[PDB]
């Protein structure tokens, strides 16, 4: 077994025989319920993109764990001179863990790592094809739609989370199109919520993708769910 | 309706009850046909990548008009210290502004940003798929051909603006594909004929694309068409 | 004819009525058979991404040659403040030079330049389409699976260079269905073995790519092929 925890915004908390965290934006998350005391030991730190909102508190978590943060190597190389323990990868690249495998798919995005106020090159966006114990989680991060996610319909996604929220992401009615390029067992939606910008009619989403035969599971920030 | 006049190399401009000018590459560009004081008053900016022939005069046109600027996240954050209203989006996002949807389209190019002789980063480049009055532009920017153009195939463009030059972008014989891909209802070939290097064969083109059934409109950098 | 020639990793030499390198990471590759004296006289350079493992020795081999590199805009603007003669061009870009037509095809990858510490953007990461007379050789670049390469199909490649090595690019797996996404004439592994990180079952790829009806041909770093 493995417990899911969705904790607002693009966070997920994967609790398994490793813990492993992905994107996370903790501190001055509005809507997340935690502080970066509320988590469990972390082991491994899955970064999608460079932007704050999915960096995140990477830094300082994965120091007081002695974690190690999987992203790319553009990412890793910045995180690396922050005195930052790494496992660079690149898009469309697997690797297996001890934990699983975790694979970086493609995505539709800036990757600018904000460093004071100067942007810094971190790569290209990506998302994460996570198998573990025979589950497979897909993280899309930050995305519009693209046809690169009709590549995952054969790897048969127990749950995928896709972002909702519109203006920097997909929106609801895009969403659902990639729900059924992807084809995941259930779907979990995010990027929504956590500024009025990206306010979304998430019960019209679960209705809309249900017709598609996806079975969507609400979570709240905090809110979990196992495979 | 609305009255959308092409000002040369990629500089598109829509007048409708809210004007908006895409790419105002206006100061510098050997073909068009107007001077930054030719240019109606500005309401928005739309700007697809970070690059010379993109950004243009967005700055000196932004504080001239009090226009917001609308682009990626990165291109919106060097243009905000630069004293400059931004609405913020990234690929695949679109939102509902007073005139219309705006939503940026993926596209294979990139996006720096020439400050000094500094290359900074801009994100990730993208086209436009504007929607006023239940009619749809779409303005590809630079761009290869990609698979993501057919996602817009639905969308039932009413003009498409397509790069034809090569070098830089697709040359005549993928422009064509890329048409047929999206299948809108005119095409208009752009990105040519601004220098030596992108003189290319757009009588050739309108001749290939229009045998495939979509009709061409070759307008000159100053002409126009209406919606 | 030519004679096509790979040196580790990503490198590949192409000797014909010129002579051509992709991605010349000379210095510093353990697997490449030769020094940068090992080199016949170089008449262009194609550099597919910012990354030291293809960028290389670039600027020296460009210098001592006087060789032109063919690279994106963001690159060959780094090359060009390093006094270095340079055709940029851009993804989807094709031009016709003296020795035949390239064209940069789309990749998923990252395409960071790394000055001393400094991690400079380097535009977006590419593969090669390069035609001459009338032979076609793809080389991939550093990728993850990507349906951009599906647009390649109707090219007819005679060779084709894609990676296999894993988590910086795509796995045996993943590169078998490029290969048949691409359907070239024949097929040649790059990137693997370099490092440990990337070992890969070259064998079991062979076997598994020609099941699938497409001819492997294993080239060891210094063997070669004709066209
Ligand atoms: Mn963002
Ligand atoms: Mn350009
Ligand atoms: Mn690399």
Excluded: Q
């Amino acid at each position: 077994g493995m417990k899911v925890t969705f904790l607002g915004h693009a966070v997920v908390l994967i609790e398994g025989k490793k813990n492993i965290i992905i994107d996370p934006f903790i501190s001055g998350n509005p809507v997340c319920p935690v502080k970066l005391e509320g988590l469990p030991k972390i082991d491994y730190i899955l970064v999608t993109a460079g932007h704050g909102d999915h960096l995140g508190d990477a830094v300082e978590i994965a120091k007081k764990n002695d974690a190690t943060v999987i992203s790319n190597y553009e990412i890793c190389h910045y995180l690396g001179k922050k005195g930052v323990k790494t496992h660079a990868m690149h898009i469309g690249g697997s690797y297996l863990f001890d934990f699983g495998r975790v694979k970086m798919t493609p995505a539709v995005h800036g990757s600018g790592i904000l460093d004071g106020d100067s942007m810094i090159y971190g790569g290209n966006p990506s998302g994460f094809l996570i198998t573990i114990e025979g589950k497979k989680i897909y993280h899309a991060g930050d995305t519009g739609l693209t046809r690169e996610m009709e590549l995952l319909a054969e790897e048969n996604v127990d749950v995928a989370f896709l972002p909702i929220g519109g203006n920097f992401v997909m929106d609801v009615e895009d969403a659902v199109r990639a729900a059924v390029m992807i084809k995941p067992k259930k779907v979990v939606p995010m990027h929504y919520g956590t500024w009025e910008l990206i306010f979304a009619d998430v019960e019209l989403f679960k209705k809309k993708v249900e017709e598609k035969g996806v079975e969507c599971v609400i979570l709240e920030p905090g809110e979990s769910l196992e495979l």
